[PDB]
């Protein structure tokens, strides 16, 4: 609903701005404040765009505003396949990301690999792992690549 | 080492009998993992939960070790950092313990050296002995037909009131007074009673000197106790055996009494938890329950646990989903029935429904 | 026949039984997996 | 020649000729049935002389495998084949495949097999080759004179209760 | 929406042999065929059978093959219609599977025309009445429970008591010299079962690869999954239909086992989101199978003449499946597996056995009479049994103990030796004809064989067999006596 | 030139043995009954099963090792094909998982494949020898036979297939290796401790060469539970096709789908009789169907199955059980209370079959079992309703049915012979165990000098084919197996009968019983 809303007007940026306004305020609200919510009511979402906060009402009207992290990421994954940009997540050490240089050349020799994202452009996500104490990994597009050691 | 989700915050956000989810921020801790509940809630008691199952990558389902009285959604909880341990050692000989390893004797601290998860691995195929021996009890009928082997895995099923308990008595009296090596009573979904009994009975006799040297430990959660514990305390009495096993090469006795209870509190727990039951009503994991449970109780080679099992026949229905799959775990099988007692005949055991596994010419005369 | 029409009757009597709580707990697994969905409803018109 | 047909009604291949080379070829007689195996595997049944040159192997053969097996016997395994060629295959076995026996009787000196194979041949087929009656019989007379007719434990004198029933 | 052939959906769901699919252009109509084009990596092609239009965009189907390597958004293709079935004399000699693909290895079948599974049952006008007596050549079932050309006969019984046994004997006696055509429905049995049929019928000529055969096999047997069992007997079915109506020819049709087809559509019945009814089967039972049987009919244009056989489980004859399938018969034969145990075979229990040409009208009046005389002593023969076990055989009046020894040869007399159990007995089977049995019973009833001994009647086919067996028997006991004088 | 796995997932839910997978965004997805890796480490994977494909995108899985390394928001890797165990010759005598890991004691073949076509089968002709009297004569077993063995707690349920697989130690080491029987014994939910008795069982007979362990005990999950029997034939199935023999013994069945109801109610699949999936007759319909007879086009192998199944108070109309019976053709029914009578094994003829019949004996044994099997008969209906010759041999051959050990083939059709012609009426029907000791273990015409046989001797071991070859009635045997018979028979009741009948004191009378007990655990 959210990529057909922001699909007429072409513009996809304002609903990421406003999962990051989403994202900022959730976190000094209180614990298990969608179970509590009155989107209405509360002003950080005042300034969210009017496809945003419809859907907001949306899922308040149904309670399932513990989705809205996971909405997002699908929408994310819409605008990316429609603008065309590959997401290389680079799984790294708590702190550890420091270098990704590797990563990065990694992700690139993936990518050209890959005949199906030869036009796409290529992005890189940092996500940090706990499971891994050194190395990295990356994946794209389904391809997992571990160069990484845990405890031992 | 130090675990990485030690001090790790959760909420709780849902409570339904025994059963509490916890919502964690940075995620939910390993299953089997150990929670504390740190607001007062007005409670006389702390509150202890363990994990069962992961409902999502924040949320996990736990159950209470304790009664959930007064809790409120929201509430804090803490995590301890590992499973829960229980004391081991020559120092938790001469006491009594409960579920979670605390002496409830009202005497001096335990002062143990170290303390050791209740859930572990069983012993691999490997590590499995290979001795047969006559244990003689002074009983003519086990002696004769269903002869007990040293080491090995023995089971008493019977209904209410048919003499399991007292067996089990006499058997103490025969055996663990008389035995070199160690002894652990795990009570489980028993009266109290009996178990102070007990306790008094071990102190006339002296295998539990106060001031001196004891062979015998006694762990006890009983009927009194909620579903969580009656779950848990055969663990515990039962990792305390496998250090004296294991860490000592001592033998042991471990005089369970009634294991039915345990199977029955998991189905207690499973229904809470969600789950579609199986026939009767039993839990549908009843079999891989008891096959974790029970492969821990075995003689490796570098030790030998001899186990006393009674199992609670339901209603007298030997067929029951809980016994009929006990029978496979046992090397001996004691069988008693109601009309035989009606008749006299004490002890009821009814010779045709026993067996044994050591009743062979290369074992016995 | 005063000990086998008094388990002729304890055994009509837990066939009734156990085939209910077999027939109510696929009917429980049937409706569980049953999930409800996203209402589209007038949220704004109430 | 003509086309064989299986159970079904299918062919099976007839040129069985590379076959028998590979089997002339074996050093333990172990190996050879694993060229029947491949054979029936191909639906290239075996015929009597392939059956016949797996029992020259098995005389001719060292020993089963490289190494020694307990219990092998060159006349079990030779006897279970014809039994499998007779009864699983619908063949009568030749003079030439009882020959075999015979000659690994006397070879092995087990003078008593030899005594029924001897009536065998002197039934199904025309009598017995006079070389190997006289041998079974020279096989004899050694074991007759050395006192070896019987194993001893078995000509032991008992009684009711001087015997050990293990 | 006419036309759906070519029709593209997408997969949607899959848990076991239940697979849900999703059409942008409407899901076709049920009962329709679709094939999992993508290329998954399978050995064998999957295709799917459409139950039930979950909307007007989905639908859920049960798969014929194995749903492995399925994936989710796998790309479906309509058939365009119901699942379709060669037919003609084409067919005859070789072994179909649930699809009509020939798994004989014998080369392409030439197919001029090809039909449904699934068609409409025929109407009441579409009834013929025909009431004549078939002759098996078995003394049991000739004489207490008569089978008639062109109904319906059942054959309930539990496991291990010969109902596969019968079936066999049966088409030694009645396909070998029929002048129609036979089809074979094998439905989740045993597999080497099928493949003893296939050689027995080769080496009876009944097939004949060389010239002309007159018998067609179609086999879904217990490793092919739910989806398929629920199907082969349409197919079978279809392919004697097509013999009746087209050919206008009298067709046999064996069935085993017809119990499957019940089984198998419970199995999916509990994906299919339905609640299951008493004892655990669907709750279609009851009009799943009357739409199967209905089709199993003998028409104006032609006859079919159906045996089935029929699985009581655990000897549970009042389980639903056994019971439900009792009014869709014309003649019912109830084997019994205390009778086996007893050395008695075939196992019949001719007291719950019934035929609906058990009438004068329709047979002669001595085989009713006879039939009736019979039942009535063996009924007789089971009260006394009672009395015999409390008081003693000596208590017995004389009259009931002439019963009691008459009956007793009855019982023994109703046992044969089939011509396919030779194996199993070791000896000769015997073909009586329909005079032969009457006659023989007859001459039993009213004592004109009181004299022979009762073993003489076991285990033999008509009276004359009885005669001799009974003079061989006085042979070796005089021979015995004369070793006993001797010593 | 990058080990690159395929992504599709996190891991969202757990619960026991089994979890449940939410797909990440645009990934290519999993396929139905795959295995899928779920890394909890870096370096170390966890594996599972694919169950379940949902409308949502959640997938099911069935966890199969390192469950307790398992949590949530862990990652998952497809590996897109289905499960491929380790076969051939180089595991035998070793114990395997379901997964073809090795267990340490103190060729990929498919698990999923399709069981032989009708055309690729042909008659069960060829004898497996169990070594015990009762089921070698009156339930033959063939090779590529599904004979079921079902029974009570505690009734020899697990020996007599144990036996069944040491018999074959004697015949493999003589004949050729083309005819020689693989055993794959699979435990199903069993004690640990169990199968390493029967491994070292196995291992004093020497039949670990020729037999492999498949072990899932209790501890481990029910997924593997659930595999054994799958992975097991699979390793029986490399043999099959490559024109060779196999036997498969499920120890055991009912714990099999104790498994499969374990995963199916925790994976949300609606239940059925007993709480037992709907589909759960299919399970053990496609496991044993894969044990056929290939026709001599595709090799001539063959894999034998002896599925076990455990009865409550000899109730048969069970669910799983009476499935199984109608799905195996034949079965040995052994009843508790002939087994605490003192008849061992313990096996009901009356209820057991085999549906294979006389096609599964040997030439010799078909005449002996078809005439044996009417005195039988007759001995049953005599008693239920007299010292006449069928019930004067039918005792005797109750007793030589006795049996603690497999007997070697030649042993046991002589001494049915002997029965059945007569030649033990005279001997009383307790000491009929002792004159089979002495028939097998000694030989008394020599002890007393009065044996004039050429060659037919019971100490002469390589008999055993002579006699498979040419039948008991026949002239080159017939003649001197009478003589040595009547010789037996009469030095054996000269001197011992007639000593035995002559004991009075109490010593003696002792010293009697243990001989004569003894005898049942010998011969
Ligand atoms: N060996 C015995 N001799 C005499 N009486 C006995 C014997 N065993 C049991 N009883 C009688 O049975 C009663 C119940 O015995 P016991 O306490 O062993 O029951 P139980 O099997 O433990 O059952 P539950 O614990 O469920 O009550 C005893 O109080 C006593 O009256
Ligand atoms: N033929 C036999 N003669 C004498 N004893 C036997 C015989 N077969 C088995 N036994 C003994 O009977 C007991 C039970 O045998 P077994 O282990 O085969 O039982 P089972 O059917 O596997 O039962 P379960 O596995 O449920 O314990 C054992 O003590 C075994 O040694
Ligand atoms: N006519 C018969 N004579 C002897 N035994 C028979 C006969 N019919 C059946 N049997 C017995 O039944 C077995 C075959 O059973 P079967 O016909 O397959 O029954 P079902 O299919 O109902 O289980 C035979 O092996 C034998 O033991
Ligand atoms: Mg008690
Ligand atoms: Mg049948
Ligand atoms: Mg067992």
Not at chain 2, 187 to 201: A, F, H, I, P
């Amino acid at each position: 609903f959210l990529y057909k809303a922001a699909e007429e007007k072409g513009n996809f940026d304002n609903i990421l701005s406003d999962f990051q306004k989403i994202a900022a305020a959730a976190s000094k609200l209180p614990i298990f404040w969608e179970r509590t919510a009155v989107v209405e009511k509360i002003p950080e979402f005042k300034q969210l765009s009017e496809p945003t906060f419809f859907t907001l009402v949306w899922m308040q009207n149904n309670g399932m505003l513990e989705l809205i992290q996971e909405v997002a990421e699908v929408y994310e994954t819409f605008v990316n396949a429609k603008q065309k940009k590959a997401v290389a997540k680079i799984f790294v050490a708590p702190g550890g990301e420091k270098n990704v240089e590797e990563a990065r050349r990694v992700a690139e020799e993936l990518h050209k690999g890959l005949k199906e994202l030869a036009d796409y452009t290529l992005v890189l996500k940092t996500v940090v792992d706990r499971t891994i104490v050194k190395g990295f990994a990356v994946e794209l597009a389904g391809q997992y690549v571990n160069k990484a050691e845990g405890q031992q | 080492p130090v675990a990485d989700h030690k001090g790790r915050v959760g909420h709780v956000s849902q409570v339904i009998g025994a059963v509490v989810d916890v919502h964690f921020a940075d995620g939910v801790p390993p299953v089997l993992t150990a929670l504390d509940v740190v607001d007062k809630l007005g409670r006389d008691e702390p509150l202890t939960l363990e994990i069962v199952q992961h409902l999502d990558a924040h949320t996990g389902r736990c159950i209470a070790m304790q009664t959930t009285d007064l809790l409120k959604l929201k509430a804090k909880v803490v995590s301890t950092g590992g499973n829960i341990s229980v004391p081991v050692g020559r120092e938790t000989l001469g006491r009594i313990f409960n579920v979670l390893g605390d002496a409830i004797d009202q005497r001096g601290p335990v002062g143990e050296k170290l303390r050791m998860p209740i859930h572990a691995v069983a012993p691999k195929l490997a590590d499995q002995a290979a001795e047969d021996a006559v244990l003689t009890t002074g009983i003519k009928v086990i002696d004769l037909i269903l002869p007990y082997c040293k080491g090995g895995k023995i089971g008493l099923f019977g209904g209410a009131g048919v003499g399991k308990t007292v067996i089990i008595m006499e058997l103490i009296n025969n055996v663990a007074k008389g035995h070199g090596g160690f002894s652990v009573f795990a009570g489980v979904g028993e009266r109290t009673r009996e178990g102070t009994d007990l306790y008094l009975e071990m102190m006339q006799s002296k295998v539990i000197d106060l001031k001196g040297e004891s062979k015998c430990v006694l762990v006890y959660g009983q009927m009194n106790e909620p579903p969580g514990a009656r779950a848990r305390v055969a663990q515990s009495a039962l990792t305390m055996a496998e250090y004296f096993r294991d860490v000592e090469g001592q033998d042991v006795l471990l005089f369970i009494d009634n294991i039915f209870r345990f199977t029955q509190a998991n189905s207690e727990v499973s229904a809470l938890l969600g789950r579609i039951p199986a026939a009767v009503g039993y839990q549908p994991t009843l079999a891989e329950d008891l096959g974790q449970l029970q492969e821990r109780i075995t003689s490796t080679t570098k030790g030998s646990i001899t186990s006393v099992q009674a199992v609670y026949v339901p209603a007298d229905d030997i067929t029951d989903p809980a016994p009929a799959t006990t029978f496979s775990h046992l090397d001996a099988t004691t069988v008693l029935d109601r009309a035989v007692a009606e008749s006299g005949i004490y002890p009821a055991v009814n010779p045709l429904e026993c067996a044994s596994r050591i009743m062979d010419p290369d074992v016995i005369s | 026949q005063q000990r086998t029409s008094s388990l002729y009757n304890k055994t009509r009597q837990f066939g009734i039984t156990a085939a209910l709580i077999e027939i109510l707990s696929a009917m429980s697994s049937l409706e569980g997996n049953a999930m409800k969905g996203v209402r589209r409803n007038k949220f704004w018109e109430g | 020649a003509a086309k064989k047909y299986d159970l079904f009604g299918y062919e099976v291949d007839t040129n069985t000729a590379p076959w028998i080379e590979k089997i002339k070829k074996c050093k333990y007689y172990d190996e050879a049935g694993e060229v029947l195996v491949n054979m029936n595997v191909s639906n290239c049944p075996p015929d009597i002389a392939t059956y016949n040159a797996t029992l020259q192997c098995i005389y001719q053969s060292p020993s089963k495998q490289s190494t020694p097996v307990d219990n092998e016997s060159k006349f079990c395994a030779m006897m279970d084949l014809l039994e499998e060629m007779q009864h699983r295959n619908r063949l009568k076995p030749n003079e030439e495949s009882w020959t075999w026996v015979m000659k690994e009787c006397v070879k092995s000196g087990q003078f008593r097999l030899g005594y029924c194979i001897q009536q065998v041949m002197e039934t199904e087929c025309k009598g017995c080759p006079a070389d190997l009656v006289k041998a079974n019989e020279a096989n004899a007379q050694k074991a007759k004179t050395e006192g070896k007719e019987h194993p001893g434990h078995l000509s032991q004198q008992a009684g009711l209760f001087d015997v050990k029933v293990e | 929406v006419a036309d759906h052939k070519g029709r593209v959906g997408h997969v949607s769901q899959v848990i076991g042999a239940v697979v849900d699919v999703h059409f942008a252009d409407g899901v076709p109509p049920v009962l329709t065929a679709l094939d999992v084009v993508d290329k998954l990596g399978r050995d064998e092609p999957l295709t799917l059978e459409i139950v039930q239009h979950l909307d007007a965009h989905t639908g859920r189907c049960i798969a014929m093959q194995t749903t492995d390597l399925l994936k989710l958004k796998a790309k479906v293709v309509s058939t365009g219609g119901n699942i379709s079935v060669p037919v003609g004399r084409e067919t005859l000699g070789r072994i179909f599977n649930v699809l009509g693909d020939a798994i004989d290895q014998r080369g392409p079948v030439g197919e001029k025309l090809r039909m449904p599974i699934h068609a409409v049952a025929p109407k009441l006008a579409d009834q013929a009445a025909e009431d004549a007596v078939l002759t098996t050549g078995i003394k049991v079932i000739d004489l207490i429970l008569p089978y008639c050309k062109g109904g319906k006969i059942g054959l309930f019984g539990g496991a291990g008591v010969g109902k596969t046994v019968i079936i066999m004997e049966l088409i030694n006696n009645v396909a070998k010299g029929h002048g129609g055509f036979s089809v074979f429905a094998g439905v989740g049995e045993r597999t080497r079962e099928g493949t003893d049929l296939y050689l027995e019928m080769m080496q009876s000529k009944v097939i004949d690869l060389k010239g002309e055969s007159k018998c067609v096999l179609v086999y879904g047997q217990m490793n092919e999954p739910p989806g398929a069992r629920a199907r082969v007997a349409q197919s079978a079915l279809t392919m004697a239909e097509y013999f009746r109506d087209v050919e206008g020819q009298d067709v046999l049709l064996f069935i085993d086992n017809i119990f499957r087809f019940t089984q198998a559509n419970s199995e999916v019945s509990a994906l299919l989101g339905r609640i299951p009814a008493a004892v655990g089967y669907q709750p279609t039972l009851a009009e799943d199978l009357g739409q199967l049987q209905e089709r199993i009919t003998s028409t104006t244009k032609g006859s079919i003449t159906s045996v089935q056989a029929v699985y009581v489980p655990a000897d549970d004859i009042t389980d639903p499946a056994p019971a439900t399938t009792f009014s869709h018969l014309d003649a019912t034969t109830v084997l019994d597996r205390a009778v086996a145990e007893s050395g008695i075979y075939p196992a019949v229990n001719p007291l719950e056995c019934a035929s609906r040409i058990m009438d004068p009208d329709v047979i002669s009046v001595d085989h009713y009479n006879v039939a009736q005389d019979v039942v009535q002593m063996l009924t007789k023969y089971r009260e006394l049994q009672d009395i015999i076990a409390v008081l003693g055989i000596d208590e017995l009046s004389e009259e009931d103990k002439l019963i009691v020894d008459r009956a007793r040869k009855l019982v023994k007399f109703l046992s044969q030796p089939f011509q396919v159990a030779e194996v199993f007995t070791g000896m000769t089977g015997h073909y009586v004809q329909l005079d032969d049995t009457i006659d023989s019973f007859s001459g039993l009833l009213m004592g004109t064989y009181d004299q022979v001994p009762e073993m003489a009647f076991y285990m033999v086919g008509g009276i004359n067999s009885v005669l001799e067996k009974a003079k061989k028997m006085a042979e070796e006991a005089a021979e015995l006596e004369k070793m006993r004088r001797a010593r | 030139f990058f080990k690159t796995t395929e992504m599709i997932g996190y891991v969202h839910s757990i619960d026991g043995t089994i979890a449940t997978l939410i797909p990440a965004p645009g990934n290519p997805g999993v396929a139905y009954n795959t295995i899928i890796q779920i890394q909890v480490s870096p370096t170390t994977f966890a594996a599972g099963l694919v169950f379940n494909l949902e409308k949502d995108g959640r997938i099911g899985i069935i966890l199969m090792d390192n469950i307790t390394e398992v949590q949530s928001g862990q990652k998952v890797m497809a590996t897109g094909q289905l499960l491929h165990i380790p076969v051939g010759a180089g595991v035998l005598g070793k114990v395997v998982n379901p997964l073809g890991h090795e267990v340490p004691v103190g060729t990929l073949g498919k698990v999923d494949t399709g069981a032989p076509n009708i055309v690729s089968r042909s008659p069960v002709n060829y004898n497996l020898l169990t070594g015990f009297k009762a089921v070698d004569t009156m339930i033959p077993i063939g090779r590529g036979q599904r004979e079921l063995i079902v029974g009570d707690r505690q009734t020899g349920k697990t020996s007599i297939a144990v036996s069944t697989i040491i018999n074959q130690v004697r015949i493999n080491q003589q004949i050729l290796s083309k005819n020689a029987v693989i055993s794959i014994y699979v435990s199903i939910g069993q004690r640990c401790s169990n199968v390493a008795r029967i491994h070292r069982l196995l291992q004093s007979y020497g039949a670990l060469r020729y037999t492999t362990v498949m072990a899932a005990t209790a501890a481990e999950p029910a997924g593997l539970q659930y595999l054994a029997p799958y992975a097991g034939v699979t390793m029986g199935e490399y043999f099959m096709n490559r024109g060779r023999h196999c036997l498969c013994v499920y120890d055991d069945l009912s714990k099999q789908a104790v498994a499969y109801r374990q995963i199916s109610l925790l994976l949300r699949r609606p239940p059925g009789r007993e709480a037992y999936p709907g589909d759960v007759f299919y399970l053990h319909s496609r496991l044993l169907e894969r044990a056929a007879m290939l026709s001599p086009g595709k090799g001539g192998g063959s894999v034998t199955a002896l599925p076990i199944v455990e009865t409550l108070s000899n109730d048969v109309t069970a669910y799983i059980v009476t499935n199984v019976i109608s799905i195996t053709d034949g079965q040995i029914y052994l009843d508790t209370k002939l087994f605490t009578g003192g008849q061992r094994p313990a096996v009901n003829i009356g209820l057991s079959v085999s549906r294979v019949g006389s096609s599964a004996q040997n030439a010799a044994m078909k005449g002996v079992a078809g005439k044996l099997k009417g005195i039988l008969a007759e001995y049953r209906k005599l008693a239920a309703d007299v010292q006449t010759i069928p019930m004067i041999r039918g005792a005797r051959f109750v007793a030589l049915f006795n049996q603690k050990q497999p007997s070697y083939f030649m042993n046991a059709i002589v001494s049915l012979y002997a029965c059945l012609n007569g030649y033990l009426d005279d001997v009383k029907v307790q000491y009929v165990k002792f004159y089979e000791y002495l028939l097998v273990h000694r030989d008394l015409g020599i002890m007393y000098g009065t044996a004039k046989n050429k060659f037919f001797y019971m100490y002469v071991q390589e008999l055993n084919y002579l006699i498979r070859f040419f039948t008991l009635n026949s002239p080159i045997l017939h003649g001197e197996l009478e003589e040595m018979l009547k010789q037996h028979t009469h030095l054996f009741l000269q001197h011992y009968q007639s000593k035995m009948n002559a004991i009075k004191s109490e010593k003696d009378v002792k010293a009697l019983k243990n001989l004569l007990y003894s005898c049942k655990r010998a011969v």
